[PDB]
């Protein structure tokens, strides 16, 4: 659970079947399994809410490497089909949690940010971040210089 909450570590869902389903193969407490996954029309919805977890939370771990992906690769990474991909694309785009834009002129599309919405921000971010770094540079290069030239 908690290792699946931080970056979710794109595991096998049948190893999730192992973990969360051999709890019924417990010669001890099964009242966790009975309360959580012993339910059927709530517990099956929890199984597919955990398929909703793999799509939901793993789109939120894959949201870094986008602005370039096709659709087949997103099927090959979300650990499901392209039809399950499009159904999950539907319910997560009506979620509209992070701004999606999907299109099938050839299929190169993704869940996305607002798609680099600005002009000169690149000059600001790149050149002023890097150059105010380069102006803090000399101010602590004199630091390093004096501290190492005390001795040698």
């Amino acid at each position: 659970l908690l290792k699946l909450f931080t970056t979710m570590e794109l595991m096998r869902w049948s190893t999730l079947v192992e973990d969360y389903g051999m709890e019924l193969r417990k010669g001890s407490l099964e009242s966790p399994a009975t309360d959580v996954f012993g339910s059927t029309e709530e517990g099956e919805k929890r199984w597919k809410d955990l398929k909703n977890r793999v799509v939901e939370h793993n789109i939120r771990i894959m949201a870094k490497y986008y602005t370039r992906i096709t659709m087949k690769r997103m099927a090959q990474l979300l650990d499901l089909s392209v039809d399950e991909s499009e159904a999950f694309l539907s319910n997560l785009v009506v979620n509209k949690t992070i701004f999606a834009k999907v299109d099938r002129l050839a299929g190169i599309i993704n869940f996305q940010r607002p798609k680099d919405p600005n002009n000169l921000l690149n000059d600001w971010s790149q050149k002023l971040n890097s150059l105010m770094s380069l102006v803090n540079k000399t101010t602590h290069l004199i630091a390093k210089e004096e501290m190492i030239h005390n001795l040698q």
Partner: protein
């Protein structure tokens, strides 16, 4: 004018301090190490 005549006050040839006041004054009152500004464009947006 009664009871008082003023005295003359000039300010010394103070280059022994005016030197270093000038030097710190302009070596400091422009961006310190002077690599600071070298804010640039959204101030131009508001200014235009």
């Amino acid at each position: 004018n009664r009871h008082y005549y003023s005295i003359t006050i000039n300010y010394r040839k103070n280059e022994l301090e005016q030197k270093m006041l000038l030097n710190l004054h302009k070596k400091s009152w422009m961006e310190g190490l002077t690599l600071q500004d070298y804010v640039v464009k959204e101030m131009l947006e508001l200014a235009k």
